[PDB]
A = this chain, B = another copy of it.
Amino acid sequence: PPGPPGPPGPPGLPGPPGPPGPPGPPGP
């Protein structure tokens, strides 16, 4: 009969970049 399932695939791509960070500190 057929062989067993192959091994797991490789890890996926890295995730996409996150969103922009928060606004910065009040100016001087």
Chain A residues packing against B (C-beta within 8 Å): 1-28
Residues of B within 8 A of A26 (CB): 23-28
User: What 9 pairs across the A-B complex have the smallest Cβ distances?
Assistant: A15-B18, A18-B21, A24-B24, A9-B9, A3-B3, A6-B9, A18-B18, A12-B12, A6-B6
| A contact face: mostly helix, strand, loop, or mixed | loop
- A17-B26 Cα distance, complex, nearest whole Å: 20
Given contacts A1-B3, A3-B2, A3-B3, contact A17 B22 (CB under 8 A): yes
Chain B residues, Cβ within 8 Å of A13: 8, 11-12, 14-15
Partner of A24, one of B2, B6, B22: B22
